[PDB]
Amino acid sequence: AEVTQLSNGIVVATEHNPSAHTASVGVVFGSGAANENPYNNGVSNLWKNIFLSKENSAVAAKEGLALSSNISRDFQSYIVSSLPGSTDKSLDFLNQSFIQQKANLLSSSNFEATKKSVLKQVQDFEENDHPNRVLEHLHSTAFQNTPLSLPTRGTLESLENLVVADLESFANNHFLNSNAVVVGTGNIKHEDLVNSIESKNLSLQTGTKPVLKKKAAFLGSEVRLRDDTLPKAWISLAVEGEPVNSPNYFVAKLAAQIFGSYNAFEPASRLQGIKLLDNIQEYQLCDNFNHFSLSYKDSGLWGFSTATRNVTMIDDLIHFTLKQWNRLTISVTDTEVERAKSLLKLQLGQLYESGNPVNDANLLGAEVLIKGSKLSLGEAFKKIDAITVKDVKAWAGKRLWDQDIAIAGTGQIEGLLDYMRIRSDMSMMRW
């Protein structure tokens, strides 16, 4: 359904869909925030925000073009959305403003304003957004002293040290031809986009990106950023998950779906077919949780992330969650796997084929940057339907039974016990 082709310098990937009413054109680079130091962290955030400057957005909005940008740990994307007859203008803007004439966005008194804007933005994230910063600290201690622990927002002390030369240096090291994938989603054809890319000479740069010296390695640890003036108690908790293009990638996604996500204030989320809600709905142990399976180029993370105002029974919450995690190793039943298979196919269909051609361009550029081609939804559904109970048991014996955990928490987490008491829940005494 989707067509990727390597033209003479660059990889063009389209996902044509004529039922759409927009067409998102963009370039997705494969050098996210894992390609930073501790000292220039947040230069990708600043590249994102000077791509989305007021000066750069007036130019696009005069032509009927909306700009969307995204920073992750693996990839970073710069996507230009437009009406379907306006793909040539999207490529003209992406060529001129971002690729060739790059030293005009990077002027003084625009870089300064955008640096002040991302300083205020990162400070507002670090003070107010409590679940997402607990997940960021979960990466910060799961993969510490290793490239994957860098927060994609960038820290507040490393963003203040940044000058224009750091953005130019990151641009020359990463915004390359061997590192880019130019993506067209919405309703532009693959022939039309590649004809437009051959028409105007579209080349970013020639060198190769810097090879990282140490691969990402999970180190079991914890961080305890307790803040007794916060109402709730946010705690993420994770084991090492499968990386992307692993054979147990969909199995890790399925095992995350066996325990699903939950929202105690929603009455139709109380009635989910999880066996953990019998434990945690008696004394209302949590307000919400979500089990995630993140996967990156080098490693991944598998666990959950919760929040509760029952600050005295944090230990019962963590205990019952990890004692349910042991059931994948010992006694996961068949209907849990079938319910999770149906719900995982539903989650994957709501993620991949939504009506938003920005998100499809993000996912397509990432999945053909890492793997070189995009796996179709039918083959993914067959790989999901081929997962048996024995596969979840083997994966949970490998990755979950008595493995090291990474924990991260903020708020009123005095009730959260220390590491060895929580890590003793990863393996029962067979009862």
Binding site: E282, Y283, M313, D316, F320
Partner: protein, 110 residues
């Protein structure tokens, strides 16, 4: 909640042994109280297993202790365990009282 928490007796065991919040910085002088509990269990068990054989008349007291040393299988183990364990009971108890005297564990709350 957990079964060690919701039970009647396991909540006592949990709040005194399992979940009992101890400070991080207490040293091996705080092991003397647990050692006194171990000492007392040793004394009670060995004393019962020697009171099974001890005869408390004035004509049979010393000879019955001598019967424990001679005729009872591993009876010298019980007798020497009782005597040396009472001496160690008082050694560890003097260390417990001296710890309370040094670190001021007698003061206003305690």
């Amino acid at each position: 909640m957990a079964f060690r928490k919701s039970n009647v007796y396991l909540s006592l065991v949990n709040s005194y042994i399992i979940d009992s919040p101890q400070p991080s910085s207490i040293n091996y002088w705080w092991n003397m109280g647990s050692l006194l509990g171990l000492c007392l269990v040793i004394q009670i068990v060995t004393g019962i297993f020697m009171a099974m054989h001890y005869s408390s008349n004035i004509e049979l007291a010393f000879s019955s202790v001598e019967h424990i040393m001679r005729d009872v299988h591993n009876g010298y183990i019980l007798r020497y365990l009782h005597a040396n364990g009472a001496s160690f009971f008082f050694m560890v108890m003097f260390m417990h009282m001296a710890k309370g005297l040094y670190y001021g564990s007698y003061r206003s709350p305690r």
